[PDB]
Design a protein around this ligand. Structure first.
Ligand SMILES: [Mg+2]
Ligand SMILES: [Mg+2]
Ligand code: NA
Length: 327
DNA sequence: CGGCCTACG
DNA sequence: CGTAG
DNA sequence: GCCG
């Protein structure tokens, strides 16, 4: 078992679902308390279990696995012995965890805002609605649409959304392309948001594209909310349903074709996979990775990539297709 | 012990 | 501060 | 919380 998630395939479904989930509760809880280090360790330990070829049945099978120390091993031990881990259940039950989870789910509310509200005594969505002067316009939209946004989107819905985006993009810039990214590109059959990456084969033609796309989608009556030069747009779209519609979170991202492989890689995730990949790049290879490029700080040069395959090769990693990036 | 991804709106 | 993966 |  290699130490970094980007060094091993991680499929979407696996053989340690219950164990990985429990560890992820503790990771999430650590994030709500601002302990990013503990969040990372619990996420990494959970991800290691996702990468295993069969179920963990005995505590000895954790020996030599990276990211399993005293704490994570105890959680697994308790689950193997009793079917439940008391620490995990205490977190699940807790008013702090439940409220921080509820508040951070809201589009426009992060951990810092949620925590402040929690400290002020606020506990429910209706608590927030009663004091609307305290809310940003983004948070107001997040709160209005919370119920719809809490329901996952199906792949058939995504395909319908992609067609409407493609029509707008085609008018905004003929020849521009739209690529589905995020969890759906990793093979997810449903998910809580839809991500699209837009480019054009002629370098430079994409400049100024996103406002033109947004204006056109707005004119079509499809945009329930958006933030407004820019290159990422975090939207709430109107998605058709039988006899009605629902609100769906859609992200639109533009990249020049020279950067497309990097943007595709970054936006395809998973979140942990990409953090791990960037950590690997810098710490093991001395190269700096982001969604625009890969920089050698010694030679002061950027690696030209024509594909995700190029990027894995330049980092000395075996290629993983998107459906094995579910770290 | 230091480090934990790296951006844009 | 929020957002993204 | 764990790695190196
Ligand atoms: Mg997504
Ligand atoms: Mg998204
Ligand atoms: Na949020």
């Amino acid at each position: 078992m290699p130490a970094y998630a980007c060094q091993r395939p991680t499929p979407l479904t696996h053989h340690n679902t219950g164990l990985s989930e429990a560890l992820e509760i503790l990771a999430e809880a650590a994030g709500f308390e601002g302990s990013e280090g503990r969040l990372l360790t619990f996420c990494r330990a959970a991800s290691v279990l996702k990468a295993l070829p069969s179920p963990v049945t005995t505590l000895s099978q954790l020996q030599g696995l990276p990211h399993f120390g005293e704490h994570s091993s105890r959680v697994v031990q308790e689950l193997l012995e009793h079917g439940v881990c008391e620490e995990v259940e205490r977190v699940r039950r807790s008013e702090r965890y439940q409220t921080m989870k509820l508040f951070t789910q809201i589009f426009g509310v992060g951990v810092k805002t949620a925590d402040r509200w929690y400290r002020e005594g606020l506990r429910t969505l209706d608590d927030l609605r009663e004091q609307p002067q305290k809310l940003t316009q983004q948070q107001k939209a997040g709160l209005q649409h919370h119920q719809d946004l809490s329901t996952p989107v199906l792949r058939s819905d995504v395909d319908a959304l992609q067609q409407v985006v493609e029509e707008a993009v085609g008018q905004a810039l003929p020849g521009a392309t739209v690529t589905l990214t995020g969890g759906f590109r990793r093979g997810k059959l449903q998910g809580h948001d839809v991500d699209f990456l837009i480019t054009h084969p002629k370098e430079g033609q994409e400049a100024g594209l996103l406002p033109r796309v947004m204006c056109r989608l707005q004119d079509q009556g499809l945009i329930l909310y958006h933030q407004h030069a820019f290159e990422r747009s975090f939207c709430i779209f109107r998605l058709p349903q039988p006899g009605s519609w629902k609100a769906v979170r859609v992200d639109l991202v533009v990249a020049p074709v020279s950067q497309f492989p990097f943007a595709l890689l970054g936006w395809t995730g998973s979140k942990l996979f990409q953090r791990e990949l960037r950590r690997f790049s810098r710490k093991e290879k001395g190269l700096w990775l982001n969604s625009h490029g890969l920089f050698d700080p010694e030679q002061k040069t950027f690696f030209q990539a024509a594909s995700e395959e190029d990027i894995f090769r330049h980092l000395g990693l075996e290629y993983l297709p998107p459906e094995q990036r579910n770290a």
